[PDB]
């Protein structure tokens, strides 16, 4: 299958027609997406198969073919870009200054951008093009708008 680094759509033919359920990142031979997109199921890439390797429901992350490779972090000051990949639409970069999710276990960056559910797993990047996390696990605030955490895994 295709193992070239980059951003990929995650599709299914189980529902009506071909439906985009999410997005992911291929880096260093490992496919990275959010757990809620695949539910830990195996994936196809052309004629090849990608098996899950690590996952965690609470972090809402999953890696295929190897361990989680993404380790860049938001610096807490600079604007970032969401590389949104919406269903049936071309990949597009959106620049934004993240907000913060404050939790009892520390603070996490958060992006206030609203895209269809099928955009979950789209990468958020810093100015060097490094992936600092994935978009698509967040909350709906007072005025009904969506705010996603910048969700990043640990590189063992």
């Amino acid at each position: 299958g295709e193992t070239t680094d980059g951003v990929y759509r995650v599709m299914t033919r189980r529902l009506l027609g071909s439906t985009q359920v999410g997005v992911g990142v291929m880096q260093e031979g490992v496919f990275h997406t959010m757990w809620h997109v695949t539910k830990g199921a195996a994936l196809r890439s052309g004629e090849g198969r990608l098996d899950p390797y690590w996952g965690d429901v609470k972090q809402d992350l999953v890696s295929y073919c190897g361990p989680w490779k993404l380790d860049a972090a938001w610096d807490g000051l600079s604007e970032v870009q969401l590389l949104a990949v919406p269903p049936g639409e071309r990949a597009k970069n959106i620049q934004t200054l993240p907000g913060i999710f404050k939790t009892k276990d520390g603070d996490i960056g958060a992006v206030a951008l609203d895209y269809p559910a099928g955009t979950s797993g789209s990468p958020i990047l810093d100015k060097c093009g490094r992936v600092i996390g994935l978009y698509g696990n967040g909350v709906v605030i007072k005025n009904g708008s969506y705010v996603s955490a910048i969700t990043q895994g640990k590189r063992e």
Binding site: Q81, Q95, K102
Partner: protein, 39 residues
């Protein structure tokens, strides 16, 4: 049966569209991976 299809390279775009605010929110994360607002 799920499958993947390449959608692009991962690069920073100079002069990309700039939008979104930066809210500071108190949140809780449950064991099922769901975030909720703390008030």
């Amino acid at each position: 049966d799920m499958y993947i299809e390449r959608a692009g390279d991962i690069t920073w775009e100079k002069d990309a569209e700039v939008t979104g605010n930066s809210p500071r929110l108190d949140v809780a994360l449950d064991e099922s991976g769901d975030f909720s607002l703390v008030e």
